[PDB]
Design a protein around this ligand. Sequence first.
Ligand SMILES: CCCCCCCCCCCCCCCCCC(=O)OC[C@H](COP(=O)([O-])OCC(O)COP(=O)([O-])OC[C@@H](COC(=O)CCCCCCCCCCCCCCCCC)OC(=O)CCCCCCCCCCCCCCCCC)OC(=O)CCCCCCCCCCCCCCCCC
Ligand SMILES: CCCCCCCCCCCCCCCCCC(=O)OC[C@H](COP(=O)([O-])OCC[N+](C)(C)C)OC(=O)CCCCCCCCCCCCCCCCC
Ligand SMILES: CCCCCCCCCCCCCCCCC[C@@H](O)O[C@H](CO[C@H](O)CCCCCCCCCCCCCCC)COP(=O)(O)OCC[N+](C)(C)C
Ligand SMILES: CCCCCCCC/C=C\CCCCCCCC(=O)O[C@H](COC(=O)CCCCCCC/C=C/CCCCCCCC)COP(=O)(O)OCCN
Ligand SMILES: CCCCCCCC/C=C\CCCCCCCC(=O)O[C@H](COC(=O)CCCCCCC/C=C/CCCCCCCC)COP(=O)(O)OCCN
Ligand SMILES: *P(=O)(O)OCC(C)(C)[C@H](O)C(=O)NCCC(=O)NCCSC(=O)CCCCCCCCCCCCC
Lengths: 52, 99, 459, 54, 128, 69, 178, 174, 87
Amino acid sequence: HVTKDMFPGPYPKTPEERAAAAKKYNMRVEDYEPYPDDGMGYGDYPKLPDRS
Amino acid sequence: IRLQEDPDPEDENLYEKNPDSHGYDKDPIVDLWNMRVVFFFGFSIVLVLGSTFVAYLPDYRMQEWARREAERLVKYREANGLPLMESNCFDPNKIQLPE
Amino acid sequence: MLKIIIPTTMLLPMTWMSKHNMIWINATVHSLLISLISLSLLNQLGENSLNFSLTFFSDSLSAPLLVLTTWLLPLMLMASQSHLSKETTTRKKLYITMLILLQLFLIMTFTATELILFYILFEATLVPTLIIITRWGNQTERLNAGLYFLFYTLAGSLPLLVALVYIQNTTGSLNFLIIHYWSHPLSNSWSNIFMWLACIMAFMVKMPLYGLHLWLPKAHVEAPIAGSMVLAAVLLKLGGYGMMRITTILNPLTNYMAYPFLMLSMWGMIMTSSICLRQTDLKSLIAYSSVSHMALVIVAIMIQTPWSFMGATALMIAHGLTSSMLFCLANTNYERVHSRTMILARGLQTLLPLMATWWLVASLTNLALPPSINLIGELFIITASFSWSNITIILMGMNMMITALYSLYMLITTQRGKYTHHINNIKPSFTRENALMALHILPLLLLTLNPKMILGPLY
Amino acid sequence: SSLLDLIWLETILPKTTSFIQMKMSIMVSNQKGLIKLYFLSFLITIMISMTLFN
Amino acid sequence: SFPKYKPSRLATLPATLDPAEYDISPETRKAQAERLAIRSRLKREYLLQYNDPNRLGVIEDPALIRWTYARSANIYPNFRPTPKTSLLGALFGIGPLFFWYYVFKTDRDKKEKLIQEGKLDQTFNISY
Amino acid sequence: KRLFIIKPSGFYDRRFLKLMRFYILLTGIPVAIGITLVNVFIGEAELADIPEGYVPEHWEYFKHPISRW
Amino acid sequence: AFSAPAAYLTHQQKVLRLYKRALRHLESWCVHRDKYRYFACLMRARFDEHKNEKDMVKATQLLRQAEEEFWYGQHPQPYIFPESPGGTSYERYECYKVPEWCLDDWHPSEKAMYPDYFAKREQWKRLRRESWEREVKQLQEETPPGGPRTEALPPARKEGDLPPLWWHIVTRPRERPM
Amino acid sequence: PDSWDKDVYPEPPRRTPAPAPQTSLPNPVTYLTKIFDLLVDRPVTLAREFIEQQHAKNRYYYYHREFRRVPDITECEEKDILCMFEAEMQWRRDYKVDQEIVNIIQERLKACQQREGESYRQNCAKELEQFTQVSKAFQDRYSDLGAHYSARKCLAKQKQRMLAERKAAKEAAA
Amino acid sequence: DAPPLTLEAIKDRVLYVLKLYDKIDPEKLSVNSHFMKDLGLDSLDQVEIIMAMEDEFGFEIPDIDAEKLMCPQEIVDYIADKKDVYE
Ligand SMILES: CCCCCCCCCCCCCCCCCC(=O)OC[C@H](COP(=O)([O-])OCC(O)COP(=O)([O-])OC[C@@H](COC(=O)CCCCCCCCCCCCCCCCC)OC(=O)CCCCCCCCCCCCCCCCC)OC(=O)CCCCCCCCCCCCCCCCC
Ligand SMILES: CCCCCCCCCCCCCCCCCC(=O)OC[C@H](COP(=O)([O-])OCC[N+](C)(C)C)OC(=O)CCCCCCCCCCCCCCCCC
Ligand SMILES: CCCCCCCCCCCCCCCCC[C@@H](O)O[C@H](CO[C@H](O)CCCCCCCCCCCCCCC)COP(=O)(O)OCC[N+](C)(C)C
Ligand SMILES: CCCCCCCC/C=C\CCCCCCCC(=O)O[C@H](COC(=O)CCCCCCC/C=C/CCCCCCCC)COP(=O)(O)OCCN
Ligand SMILES: CCCCCCCC/C=C\CCCCCCCC(=O)O[C@H](COC(=O)CCCCCCC/C=C/CCCCCCCC)COP(=O)(O)OCCN
Ligand SMILES: *P(=O)(O)OCC(C)(C)[C@H](O)C(=O)NCCC(=O)NCCSC(=O)CCCCCCCCCCCCC
């Protein structure tokens, strides 16, 4: 039942897109942080802490 | 909505109507006979009969023939003092080398 | 071979004339009978082949492949009738027709005695497979997967057609016996290099060679269960059979041209195993395992020694059986939870014990556990590679370690741990699924009992 | 998995070939259907065939 | 005083030793409250579906769907050829192949040179 | 005080194993009995020199009775 | 485990958690009971020494230094109860925990082997089905418009109701199931 | 036992020393051997006597196939497919027989090693030289033909060996 | 193997430990007494009491749960619930 609007997208380049990405990933806008746009295909997926 | 589309149907469980089902068919009799023919033919016929047939296939690869021939060759060659393995596959007299 | 070919072409009208509820029963029973009849081809000779007629012949390399094809058809029927319950009668019969046509093409492919008839049939196998994938696959990506599969294979195989007709014009014949008896050395020239490339590249794409393999995960993941079973077990082996057959006319140029392909095969074997270690999808994991094993077979054919060919034949048969079984197990899990993600369904040992046993046995055969024919083939290839060079042992050992790692990782992830709490529809395993797994696994151990039947002509 | 299989092996053969074919298809099929334009093309073809073919 | 602890990537910093844990701002408290509210909302949704007596099947997880999609199908659309990507790809995809080619070529050349010179121990080497 | 042990259904696995055993032993047991009877009573052939002027058949070149058949 | 966590730990909660962890690690160092009693009393003496402290900045700095001291002096191999997360018997009986939904897929013969158990189970299933609507209504009546601000759940306010979202808590598998 | 040929598979005469006990204590090995002969050897011997009686009533014979020699690849003309086929089949059969001869010599070597035991390095010198000679000849014949070996390839290998030997002989006689 | 626990046994053991506590007067200690409202202990005393119970019954009470057990009856109910004791 996931809509096309609930999938990972491209790297966010505007604060509106960062806010939309944060809301999509159930995260605070302050906590949301993508991977750097180095063209590795991460997209707007969040960079969560590297713990286990 | 952009279409007049059917809702996604609920998954159908074969054990609800037929508790002692084999998973072959909705009909109990067809399901039972599908199980029976699969088990009988596959397991009994193919497995047992094909395994025993392959086990008792005639020795057409000539393993035992080659062993008996080798025993005869070894016996003859060691009786007469010849080398057991000949040094050349072919006859050098028949072979004609370039000058 | 007609005593096996005609009953398949009679499976066709029987399928279309049987009642609506007897199609699966009839198809399964008569497929089993045809498999039993094809078991008679294993009585081979030590000197030459079984030359049935001008058109068909059988060998120690063809016979196990034919037996595997004929045995795989009824298993595909069982899995298909699992997943095709709600279909209409006409579409069920069309699916069974595609399976029967694929089996007929494969039989004639393995028994064709001319390189051109072999080419025609081995290219004819594409249409039923493409139809099956792109029509009865579940997800959106079946269309792109079919495009990738079709165009990779055709780009590989068209220069093969050009090379085959060129060789027929040059030597007068494409008969395998004649080209074997009248073979001449291939001189080191650019023309010969490109002839070698045409042939070998066709079969390397079909194998697949590492770097020419993306179509394989695309198609094997997105195909229905019967499509996945036939793609991995049999269709990957057309490349090996063709490479073994066609390298008669490619010597001694194979000594110099095999370096890039050996390097690709060894390093990509390592790379695909490492990929398997970190796959979030179960079907993709099994597909990449298939790629690694076929890389090993490519190494065997390229080094091209009597010990390597026997290992290649054994590994091809063993991989066919093992990969088909793994695909069936994953498909049962998918039919439970309707998702291919590996971490979604856990604790399946405490929910379904006998399926846990089947998973254990399939994963124990996937890694080379002695004395299984998987290990026999892998070990013969490793020994031949050791005679070729002494660092191939380093690469081979690394590959074996990674293979054990990812096989047991898959087993532990799916079967062990604690069950997902919210998945409350894991019904007990069906007799049909249990019998499918048993019919996959028992022949493998019997082949362990009698191993000379799958070691090829070089035995 | 990512850099080689999903990215670079995909870019070299199938993605680049598909992109080139799509671009050439757009170039070929992007015509306004003007008889003046493609008859001038015919004239150029005729002159080239007369001169450069002997 | 006591020797200090140096965190690594594979031995991270404990929460009790994090300096930010003892410098709490009023905005930090509201950030914590907002995070807890998000968790509570998600937990309520999951628990309602979980305890539904009429639910049969798998509770679909959008987070899991997004994770699997981002890991495979969203990589190429978001890939650009950069200097870093090109260099890493060329290295990791070409360097090993040529390294192994050189190793095996040199080894086999030495082996064949010894064979030709007739000073390589090949006795009992029947199986090849 | 015995407590009820919640377990998954073993009926279906037990039934499959029972059917599989039955259908393997349906034909396997007669095959084993027949092989034993043939081996005990119709022994294996013994090697002999070909009598002069006599032309054998392939089954006469093979040893085991079942293989010859 | 049984209790819903809060947004943050208070200073008192942090101090008490440090006290318990320090006493446990001191016990791990001091194997014998008399030695442990002696040094545990000294540790409590230190905590009581700093017990009365109005300057919360100084209190937080004291807690930080105590945490650093603990991390330096902690036992590399502290004692863990067998059933605790680091313990040897942790999660051993998870493969024996089966759910009641797994129970209801039984064959009729299997269910016939336990006639009295399944009558009570049917009563429980009826009780579950008769209360779900009241449970969801109570949950949606008492929530704030913004949504749940915490993970706590209310009790049953009426004489005929049940605490909302109770089934899996009540019917969780036993700690020693098989 | 007349099952195999003692010339093909030789064994030295077995020298078993007579027992020379020096104690009054009973020999548990002797007692257990007597028990084994009473409980096991007698029933199995009776069973074999019954089976061999049943076999002798149904006596029948099988023969060893004899292949006559045919012209070889040296005599076959170029691209004469029939003679080439017969020569190739004959060469394949000879290859099989040579493989089995090497197997027989290896069996001799292994049996002698085990039989001699702690003095095998000296007592198995005769078998080691025979294996060395047989294996060297087999290797020189069929060493590096490849997966697609044939009588033509072996003939080319032998012609190359003959050319090398002729050149070496000329250089030595120079 | 080991005998099953009972509510009376758990109650007896918790009250036994509490009577062996020196800061609690055994005469005025009951199963409903509050550690701080009517026994006069503090948070550190409650921590030590919970640790004593952990040593008594051989399992651990997490800090999130242990901070709320302010009554011997509450401790008994917690332990019975965790050990699946209903009698
Ligand atoms: C002989 C058996 C077959 C063998 C085939 C081998 C090759 C032969 C080729 C030519 C065959 C003849 C022409 C048949 C046309 C049939 C059309 C049709 O309506 O079919 C359904 C029809 C029954 O359904 P219906 O009542 O008409 O209702 C139709 C509605 O559409 C029902 O409604 P619906 O909505 O449920 O149906 C929708 C369905 C309806 O769609 C269809 O029915 C279309 C079927 C395919 C179109 C025809 C293609 C012809 C071109 C050659 C390739 C054919 C391969 C597949 C053959 C299928 C045969 C049915 O369409 C789909 O589902 C779409 C699927 C799309 C993908 C699959 C379709 C393409 C497949 C072929 C491509 C692959 C070729 C690979 C290359 C190799 C080729 C050899 O089937 C038949 O009548 C069966 C025909 C054969 C009967 C038996 C004849 C022999 C009798 C006994 C002889 C004994 C001899 C002596 C023995 C000795 C002892 C005595
Ligand atoms: C109920 C259980 C027990 C019986 C099981 C069914 C039969 C089992 C196999 C046969 C038993 C013995 C019959 C002997 C017949 C020949 C007598 C004789 O003098 O032979 C001399 C000959 C001597 O060998 P020969 O090659 O020199 O013979 C010359 C040619 N003839 C036969 C014309 C003389 O021996 C045989 O013929 C041996 C035959 C062995 C058995 C052949 C395979 C079985 C065939 C039946 C189908 C498969 C049944 C498998 C078991 C059941 C499966 C469901
Ligand atoms: C409860 C269970 C516990 C576990 C028990 C199982 C584990 C034990 C396994 C070890 C015991 C093995 C028993 C061995 C008994 C001897 C029989 C065996 O040795 O014979 C084999 C015979 O081979 C078998 O038949 C293997 C057949 C291979 C399967 C054929 C295909 C079956 C159809 C299925 C199609 C699958 C196609 C797959 C691709 C080909 C090997 O050949 P051989 O011993 O010398 O034959 C003797 C007869 N001679 C003397 C006349 C020669
Ligand atoms: C040691 C080997 C000996 C084995 C001999 C086996 C011969 C066949 C015995 C098994 C056949 C099974 C059925 C036997 C008699 C049928 C019993 C019956 O009456 O039940 C039928 C069974 O019907 C079936 O299921 C059909 C299966 C029976 C026919 C299929 C067997 C035909 C196989 C022919 C074998 C010849 C092949 C030899 C040539 C080799 C070809 C490659 C009714 O069931 P349904 O039709 O499903 O009910 C629904 C109706 N409302
Ligand atoms: C021992 C292992 C060695 C592995 C193989 C040896 C190859 C050399 C090692 C790596 C060198 C470069 C290979 C490819 C790596 C790409 C570099 C990179 O990832 O960063 C690029 C920088 O690259 C460039 O854009 C410019 C191209 C060249 C710069 C990097 C290569 C310089 C290598 C130095 C040459 C060797 C120096 C010799 C010293 C003595 C050695 C004996 C982008 O920068 P960022 O945006 O910060 O992304 C990184 C995120 N943390
Ligand atoms: P109850 O609610 O009465 O608790 C009273 C508390 C403590 C909450 C007070 O009301 C309070 O907040 N007081 C002021 C804050 C305070 O107490 N600060 C000091 C706390 S830390 C302190 O100074 C003690 C640290 C000494 C012990 C350090 C432990 C390190 C040793 C570890 C060794 C492990 C192996 C031996």
